[PDB]
Protein backbone atom coordinates (compact mmCIF):
# COMPACT_ATOMS: atom_id res chain seq x y z
CA UNK A 1 0.00 0.00 0.00
CA UNK A 2 2.86 2.36 0.87
CA UNK A 3 4.47 1.89 -2.55
CA UNK A 4 1.12 2.47 -4.25
CA UNK A 5 0.49 5.74 -2.39
CA UNK A 6 4.04 6.95 -3.09
CA UNK A 7 3.74 6.19 -6.81
CA UNK A 8 0.25 7.74 -6.81
CA UNK A 9 1.64 11.00 -5.42
CA UNK A 10 4.47 10.98 -7.96
CA UNK A 11 1.95 10.29 -10.72
CA UNK A 12 -0.21 13.16 -9.48
CA UNK A 13 2.71 15.60 -9.60
CA UNK A 14 3.80 14.44 -13.05
CA UNK A 15 0.21 14.66 -14.31
CA UNK A 16 -0.11 18.18 -12.89
CA UNK A 17 2.97 19.21 -14.88
CA UNK A 18 1.83 17.34 -18.00
CA UNK A 19 -1.61 18.97 -17.95
CA UNK A 20 -0.07 22.41 -17.49
CA UNK A 21 2.09 21.79 -20.56
CA UNK A 22 -0.81 20.34 -22.60
CA UNK A 23 -3.10 23.31 -21.90
CA UNK A 24 -0.98 25.42 -24.26
CA UNK A 25 -1.18 22.77 -26.98
CA UNK A 26 -4.96 22.69 -26.61
CA UNK A 27 -5.06 26.49 -26.92
CA UNK A 28 -3.00 26.14 -30.11
CA UNK A 29 -5.37 23.61 -31.66
CA UNK A 30 -8.36 25.70 -30.54
CA UNK A 31 -6.93 28.72 -32.37
CA UNK A 32 -6.22 26.61 -35.46
CA UNK A 33 -9.78 25.24 -35.50
CA UNK A 34 -11.22 28.74 -35.12
CA UNK A 35 -9.03 29.98 -37.98
CA UNK A 36 -10.19 27.08 -40.15
CA UNK A 37 -13.83 27.93 -39.42
CA UNK A 38 -13.20 31.60 -40.24
CA UNK A 39 -11.62 30.81 -43.59
CA UNK A 40 -14.38 28.33 -44.49
CA UNK A 41 -17.04 30.96 -43.82
CA UNK A 42 -15.04 33.71 -45.54
CA UNK A 43 -14.47 31.57 -48.64
CA UNK A 44 -18.16 30.60 -48.80
CA UNK A 45 -19.28 34.23 -48.52
CA UNK A 46 -16.64 35.25 -51.08
CA UNK A 47 -17.92 32.68 -53.57
CA UNK A 48 -21.52 33.75 -52.94
CA UNK A 49 -20.54 37.40 -53.46
CA UNK A 50 -18.67 36.54 -56.66
CA UNK A 51 -21.70 34.66 -58.02
CA UNK A 52 -24.00 37.57 -57.19
CA UNK A 53 -21.60 40.10 -58.74
CA UNK A 54 -21.22 38.06 -61.94
CA UNK A 55 -25.01 37.79 -62.12
CA UNK A 56 -25.30 41.57 -61.70
CA UNK A 57 -22.55 42.41 -64.21
CA UNK A 58 -24.02 40.38 -67.10
CA UNK A 59 -21.37 37.70 -66.58
CA UNK A 60 -21.20 34.09 -65.39
CA UNK A 61 -19.15 32.99 -62.39
CA UNK A 62 -17.76 29.52 -63.12
CA UNK A 63 -17.04 27.60 -59.94
CA UNK A 64 -13.59 26.17 -59.38
CA UNK A 65 -13.61 22.51 -60.30
CA UNK A 66 -13.65 20.19 -57.26
CA UNK A 67 -10.22 19.08 -56.07
CA UNK A 68 -11.39 16.27 -53.74
CA UNK A 69 -13.59 13.21 -54.16
CA UNK A 70 -14.93 10.49 -51.86
CA UNK A 71 -15.10 7.04 -53.51
CA UNK A 72 -17.20 4.18 -52.08
CA UNK A 73 -16.96 0.63 -53.44
CA UNK A 74 -20.54 -0.68 -53.68
CA UNK A 75 -19.65 -3.88 -55.57
CA UNK A 76 -18.66 -7.26 -54.17
CA UNK A 77 -15.35 -9.06 -54.64
CA UNK A 78 -16.47 -11.61 -57.24
CA UNK A 79 -16.14 -11.50 -61.03
CA UNK A 80 -13.85 -8.47 -61.41
CA UNK A 81 -11.52 -8.13 -64.43
CA UNK A 82 -7.80 -7.96 -63.59
CA UNK A 83 -7.31 -4.27 -64.39
CA UNK A 84 -10.25 -2.84 -62.38
CA UNK A 85 -9.36 -5.33 -59.63
CA UNK A 86 -5.81 -3.95 -59.47
CA UNK A 87 -7.17 -0.39 -59.65
CA UNK A 88 -9.57 -1.01 -56.75
CA UNK A 89 -6.73 -2.59 -54.77
CA UNK A 90 -4.48 0.43 -55.38
CA UNK A 91 -7.31 2.68 -54.15
CA UNK A 92 -7.45 0.50 -51.00
CA UNK A 93 -11.04 -0.48 -51.86
CA UNK A 94 -10.88 -4.23 -51.20
CA UNK A 95 -14.36 -4.75 -49.73
CA UNK A 96 -17.92 -3.60 -50.26
CA UNK A 97 -18.88 -0.28 -48.62
CA UNK A 98 -15.23 0.82 -48.33
CA UNK A 99 -14.61 4.55 -48.72
CA UNK A 100 -11.50 6.55 -49.53
CA UNK A 101 -10.52 10.18 -50.17
CA UNK A 102 -8.81 11.01 -53.47
CA UNK A 103 -7.13 14.26 -54.54
CA UNK A 104 -8.21 14.94 -58.11
CA UNK A 105 -5.49 15.05 -60.78
CA UNK A 106 -5.22 13.54 -64.27
CA UNK A 107 -3.61 10.35 -62.92
CA UNK A 108 -6.16 9.83 -60.16
CA UNK A 109 -9.02 10.79 -62.49
CA UNK A 110 -8.02 8.07 -64.98
CA UNK A 111 -7.72 5.68 -62.03
CA UNK A 112 -11.24 6.48 -60.84
CA UNK A 113 -12.48 6.20 -64.44
CA UNK A 114 -11.19 2.62 -64.53
CA UNK A 115 -13.10 1.72 -61.35
CA UNK A 116 -16.24 3.64 -62.39
CA UNK A 117 -18.59 0.66 -63.09
CA UNK A 118 -18.01 -0.64 -59.54
CA UNK A 119 -18.01 2.48 -57.30
CA UNK A 120 -20.17 5.43 -56.34
CA UNK A 121 -18.23 8.63 -55.72
CA UNK A 122 -18.77 12.34 -55.40
CA UNK A 123 -17.81 15.66 -53.89
CA UNK A 124 -18.01 15.56 -50.09
CA UNK A 125 -19.11 18.53 -48.06
CA UNK A 126 -17.22 19.64 -44.97
CA UNK A 127 -19.85 18.26 -42.59
CA UNK A 128 -19.77 14.89 -44.35
CA UNK A 129 -15.98 14.72 -43.98
CA UNK A 130 -16.27 15.65 -40.31
CA UNK A 131 -18.94 13.00 -39.65
CA UNK A 132 -16.90 10.32 -41.43
CA UNK A 133 -13.72 11.10 -39.51
CA UNK A 134 -15.51 11.37 -36.16
CA UNK A 135 -17.53 8.17 -36.29
CA UNK A 136 -15.50 5.80 -38.51
CA UNK A 137 -12.07 7.45 -38.58
CA UNK A 138 -9.16 5.07 -38.03
CA UNK A 139 -5.41 5.45 -38.46
CA UNK A 140 -2.75 3.04 -39.72
CA UNK A 141 -0.31 2.73 -36.80
CA UNK A 142 2.36 0.03 -37.16
CA UNK A 143 0.14 -1.67 -39.74
CA UNK A 144 -2.74 -1.73 -37.24
CA UNK A 145 -6.19 -0.14 -37.47
CA UNK A 146 -6.38 2.19 -34.46
CA UNK A 147 -9.41 4.28 -33.51
CA UNK A 148 -8.96 8.07 -33.57
CA UNK A 149 -10.22 8.52 -30.02
CA UNK A 150 -7.58 11.03 -28.89
CA UNK A 151 -5.59 13.85 -30.49
CA UNK A 152 -2.34 12.28 -29.29
CA UNK A 153 -2.57 9.51 -31.91
CA UNK A 154 -2.88 12.12 -34.65
CA UNK A 155 -0.10 14.21 -33.16
CA UNK A 156 2.24 11.22 -32.71
CA UNK A 157 1.75 10.23 -36.35
CA UNK A 158 1.34 13.54 -38.23
CA UNK A 159 3.09 16.20 -36.15
CA UNK A 160 6.01 16.24 -38.56
CA UNK A 161 3.35 17.22 -41.15
CA UNK A 162 1.90 19.97 -38.89
CA UNK A 163 -1.23 17.92 -38.05
CA UNK A 164 -1.91 18.12 -34.31
CA UNK A 165 -5.67 17.56 -34.12
CA UNK A 166 -8.62 15.86 -35.76
CA UNK A 167 -9.62 19.30 -37.04
CA UNK A 168 -6.18 19.77 -38.57
CA UNK A 169 -6.73 16.48 -40.42
CA UNK A 170 -10.24 17.47 -41.53
CA UNK A 171 -8.99 20.85 -42.76
CA UNK A 172 -6.09 19.22 -44.60
CA UNK A 173 -8.50 16.84 -46.36
CA UNK A 174 -11.22 19.37 -47.18
CA UNK A 175 -9.09 22.20 -48.60
CA UNK A 176 -6.72 19.84 -50.39
CA UNK A 177 -3.43 20.71 -48.77
CA UNK A 178 0.27 20.20 -49.49
CA UNK A 179 0.29 17.04 -47.32
CA UNK A 180 -2.96 15.48 -48.53
CA UNK A 181 -1.22 12.24 -49.55
CA UNK A 182 0.22 11.48 -46.11
CA UNK A 183 -2.96 12.53 -44.29
CA UNK A 184 -5.27 10.43 -46.47
CA UNK A 185 -2.96 7.39 -46.39
CA UNK A 186 -2.73 7.57 -42.60
CA UNK A 187 -6.54 7.23 -42.56
CA UNK A 188 -7.63 3.62 -42.72
CA UNK A 189 -10.31 3.13 -45.41
CA UNK A 190 -13.70 3.96 -43.95
CA UNK A 191 -15.90 0.90 -43.34
CA UNK A 192 -19.50 2.07 -43.81
CA UNK A 193 -22.73 0.17 -43.20
CA UNK A 194 -25.49 -0.40 -45.74
CA UNK A 195 -27.78 2.58 -46.47
CA UNK A 196 -30.72 3.23 -44.19
CA UNK A 197 -33.38 3.42 -46.87
CA UNK A 198 -31.61 1.14 -49.34
CA UNK A 199 -30.08 1.81 -52.73
CA UNK A 200 -31.98 2.41 -55.92
CA UNK A 201 -33.84 -0.57 -57.36
CA UNK A 202 -30.69 -1.68 -59.22
CA UNK A 203 -27.24 -0.52 -58.11
CA UNK A 204 -24.93 -1.48 -60.96
CA UNK A 205 -25.75 1.19 -63.52
CA UNK A 206 -24.65 4.77 -63.86
CA UNK A 207 -26.28 7.39 -61.67
CA UNK A 208 -27.38 9.16 -64.86
CA UNK A 209 -29.38 6.13 -66.05
CA UNK A 210 -31.10 5.61 -62.70
CA UNK A 211 -28.51 3.35 -61.07
CA UNK A 212 -25.85 3.84 -58.42
CA UNK A 213 -22.39 3.61 -60.00
CA UNK A 214 -20.49 6.57 -61.39
CA UNK A 215 -20.38 10.18 -60.24
CA UNK A 216 -23.28 11.52 -58.16
CA UNK A 217 -21.22 14.49 -56.92
CA UNK A 218 -23.11 16.38 -54.23
CA UNK A 219 -25.58 13.57 -53.71
CA UNK A 220 -22.73 11.56 -52.29
CA UNK A 221 -23.41 13.59 -49.21
CA UNK A 222 -26.95 12.28 -49.04
CA UNK A 223 -25.64 8.79 -49.72
CA UNK A 224 -23.14 9.10 -46.89
CA UNK A 225 -25.97 10.29 -44.65
CA UNK A 226 -27.77 7.04 -45.51
CA UNK A 227 -24.68 4.89 -44.88
CA UNK A 228 -22.92 6.67 -42.00
Amino acid sequence: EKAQQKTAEERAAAKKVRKAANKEKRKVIFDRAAAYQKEYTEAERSVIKAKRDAKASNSYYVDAQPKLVFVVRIKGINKIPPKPRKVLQLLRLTQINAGVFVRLTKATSELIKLAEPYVAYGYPSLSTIRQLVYKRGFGKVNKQRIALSDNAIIEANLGKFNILSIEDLIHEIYTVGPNFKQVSNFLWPFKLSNPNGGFRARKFQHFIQGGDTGNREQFINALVKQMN
Binding site: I29, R52, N58, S149, S165, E167
Partner: protein
Protein backbone atom coordinates in the same frame (compact mmCIF):
# COMPACT_ATOMS: atom_id res chain seq x y z
CA UNK B 1 -11.58 -0.88 -25.08
CA UNK B 2 -14.72 0.78 -26.50
CA UNK B 3 -14.80 3.43 -29.20
CA UNK B 4 -17.14 6.27 -28.24
CA UNK B 5 -18.68 8.45 -30.91
CA UNK B 6 -17.82 12.14 -30.39
CA UNK B 7 -21.11 12.97 -32.14
CA UNK B 8 -22.93 11.27 -29.23
CA UNK B 9 -20.56 11.72 -26.29
CA UNK B 10 -20.11 15.45 -25.71
CA UNK B 11 -17.18 14.91 -23.35
CA UNK B 12 -15.30 12.96 -26.03
CA UNK B 13 -16.21 15.71 -28.51
CA UNK B 14 -14.60 18.32 -26.27
CA UNK B 15 -11.62 16.00 -25.81
CA UNK B 16 -11.05 15.87 -29.55
CA UNK B 17 -12.19 19.37 -30.57
CA UNK B 18 -11.96 22.09 -27.88
CA UNK B 19 -13.27 24.67 -30.35
CA UNK B 20 -16.63 22.95 -30.27
CA UNK B 21 -17.14 24.75 -26.97
CA UNK B 22 -16.78 28.12 -28.65
CA UNK B 23 -18.90 26.86 -31.53
CA UNK B 24 -21.58 25.97 -29.01
CA UNK B 25 -21.12 29.15 -26.99
CA UNK B 26 -21.29 31.52 -29.97
CA UNK B 27 -24.16 29.73 -31.79
CA UNK B 28 -22.00 29.48 -34.92
CA UNK B 29 -24.49 26.93 -36.26
CA UNK B 30 -27.24 29.57 -36.43
CA UNK B 31 -25.18 32.71 -37.13
CA UNK B 32 -26.98 35.59 -38.86
CA UNK B 33 -25.62 37.19 -42.05
CA UNK B 34 -25.83 40.96 -42.48
CA UNK B 35 -26.62 41.90 -46.08
CA UNK B 36 -28.86 44.09 -48.24
CA UNK B 37 -32.34 43.33 -49.64
CA UNK B 38 -31.02 43.64 -53.22
CA UNK B 39 -31.95 41.61 -56.31
CA UNK B 40 -29.29 41.88 -59.08
CA UNK B 41 -30.93 39.63 -61.73
CA UNK B 42 -33.50 42.15 -63.04
CA UNK B 43 -31.57 42.71 -66.29
CA UNK B 44 -29.89 40.33 -68.72
CA UNK B 45 -30.23 37.29 -66.46
CA UNK B 46 -33.95 37.29 -67.37
CA UNK B 47 -32.55 35.48 -70.38
CA UNK B 48 -33.25 32.44 -68.18
CA UNK B 49 -37.02 32.90 -68.41
CA UNK B 50 -37.11 32.82 -72.23
CA UNK B 51 -34.96 32.91 -75.36
Amino acid sequence: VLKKNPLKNKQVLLRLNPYAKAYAAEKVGSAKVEQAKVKPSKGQFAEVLKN
